[PDB]
Symmetry: C3
Subunit: 287 residues, 3 copies
């Protein structure tokens, strides 16, 4: 049976980026919808679960995306709620790389740390965005003590609460209103991640290369000035003294291979649910 991927995007039109990776991941056909909401998605899902029977269902899958992570999560919950008994197909969530980027970043760092980050301290700068929140969740799942930083404590704590409730973890929030507070926040930390706006530096070279505790840094901003000063976007475990750096492009290469591989996994069963945890498990197999 032809592998059919139904792309439900919360934005006005479907992501061109997600279409290309979907074909490279092995979908035979991709049918996309924009403006998808928890309300209109149920009827779309009915179309995926009442048209094919038995083994054939694994040949149809769903991919929910768009730029707003919270909206994508609402649609993704409405999709899982529509399934009934054996009437379901595999589904995946990744809003603008919120899951695949974060999973690639954290898997690369955990691998470079020796396989475990349990009991160590990780600080996620500008962690209130999609990738920062998901990175915080996966790090907390690995047993790291995580601090999620934001410009205002209310937003940082609201992000940490959301993460804690969804993932059953205990991330801590912290307010870093300026450059100085971010330089402070990373003191004593073993792993530092920067998940801020494009073309914005959050951690100058001097703010990390002198901190003895810091073992590995990771940056998700691919456009100079980079989130982390002193590295190159293509760095992937490059050594700076006794520390290792992961630039946004090094992480991005794994994320692309990972996103592709996930789509392929959607068609190997009709019960897969690829959100943060499952995507991360695959990211560790591929890092």
């Amino acid at each position: 049976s032809k592998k059919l991927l139904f792309q439900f995007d919360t934005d006005a039109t479907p992501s061109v980026f997600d279409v290309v990776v979907g074909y490279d991941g092995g979908a035979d056909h991709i049918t996309g919808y924009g403006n998808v909401t928890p309300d209109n998605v149920g009827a779309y899902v009915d179309g995926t679960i009442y048209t094919r029977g038995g083994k054939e269902k694994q040949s149809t899958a769903i991919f929910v995306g768009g730029g707003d992570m919270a909206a994508g999560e609402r649609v993704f919950e409405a999709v899982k709620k529509r399934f009934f008994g054996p009437f379901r197909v595999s589904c995946m969530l990744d809003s603008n790389g919120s899951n695949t980027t974060a999973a690639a970043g954290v898997a690369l760092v955990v691998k470079a740390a020796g396989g475990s980050v349990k009991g160590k301290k990780a600080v996620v700068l500008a962690g209130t965005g999609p990738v920062g929140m998901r990175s915080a969740a996966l790090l907390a799942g690995e047993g790291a003590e995580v601090v999620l930083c934001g410009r205002k404590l209310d937003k940082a704590q609201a992000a940490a609460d959301s993460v804690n409730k969804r993932f059953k973890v205990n991330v801590t929030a912290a307010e870093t209103a300026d450059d100085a507070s971010r330089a402070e926040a990373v003191k004593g930390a073993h792993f530092v991640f920067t998940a801020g706006a494009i073309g914005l530096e959050l951690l100058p070279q001097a703010a990390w290369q002198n901190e003895s505790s810091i073992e590995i840094v990771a940056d998700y901003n691919a456009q100079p000035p980079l989130g982390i000063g002193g590295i190159d976007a293509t760095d992937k475990g490059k050594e700076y003294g006794g520390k290792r750096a992961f630039g946004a492009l090094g992480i991005g290469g794994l994320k692309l291979k990972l996103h592709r591989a996930c789509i392929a996994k959607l068609f190997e069963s009709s019960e897969g649910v690829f959100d943060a945890e499952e995507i991360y498990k695959l990211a560790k197999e591929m890092a």
Copy 2:
């Protein structure tokens, strides 16, 4: 040339359901448009008749669908009106199974009745919806005396009027405002169809099993409580005493095979017109 199916849906976005079945029917590519009307479909049809020549024409086809059956009928008429001479492609009309479901159901009932229902009484309960009206039409075309029932007489009559004009038959209307009136309407009938809302019973076991005239019952509601009480949705001619029943899933199994086969037909010539008549003709060959 690749087999290209153009899906024109009268709803805001194209039916996911129709897309999967279309691909399982052999289309190599399906390109869908929502918000199609008699005014804008013309330009779309032009794109299908002026891009391929010779025998290559049969490799492009049109499928009109959506939830509003009358809206689809108006688009379908506008599509045919756009064709001229040999400048045409095969086309099919099916609004959420208006044609394919009704044809699968009536073909199975006529077959179980021994090939003819000529001169016998058929009653369609809650028959003002698409599948109810096309069922009434097909039954009337087979020579059956048909009573189309609705909660309000004017709606039932408007439904019968529509059927009678489109199909040149004389289906009669009746008001059945409650369970008591529905039970009465079936007295003396030979065939009974329930085409009511999902998850709603219209004819308890006691209202059909003790009526000697009733030979076969068919129900289009697959969600319990089923439209017909005392049967299972999977029933496909199962015997209840001297009567036979067809559940919504039993009919639906044939409907899926029929709908796929119709799509395949569209690419076999450039002059196919798959509306109630032709689809019902194929359903009888397949039942």
Copy 3:
């Protein structure tokens, strides 16, 4: 890698005509977008340049279309503005045949004129439209002295100015509000083109067959009454004295093959730019 064509249409929905030709041109998959604008196309382009590395890039391409030619040009310029360094894919512009129909018509007329039309007078009746404007531009590029006629000097000069600024040529504009004036504008002309509204005659038989100077006439209206009286929609260099005529269908035959051929070229490298210049260069090779 599968050959992915991304269609950006400025109209509300993507052209069905362009989808069929794009698939017959060799695209493995076409993903179309309506309502594209200079502002929202940038993110669509990013999805084509950040998803495939190295030589896999030539397996993704872009096609800009829609009815409004100037709108298409703005989007096309925006697409090219988004590329940078090696981060690019081939792109094509053709707004309802604006480039492929005019390229087909001009190339046919030039070939029939002996291969050179420099120093000769060419008149385009009702050439304020896309095909008219592009035909006027290609003729100017060939060295002909071109006159672009419109019902009002007002829009005629605007069309001419648009052409001259875009292709660096010196097209002249003339107002022909009467049948009489159109008959007058062609006296002394060697080549005449009619690019008027569908089903409208611009140049009656008696207005071109008795004019000594006229060598070839070309008409883009395929629906009777034709723009040029006395010919047949299918003439492809047919003789009517020492003269020759190209009807819209004769020209359209080459336009189809040319448009398919351009699509195939988009997948041979990631640096192709198919606008009037390159399309015409291929049109001459194929005429």
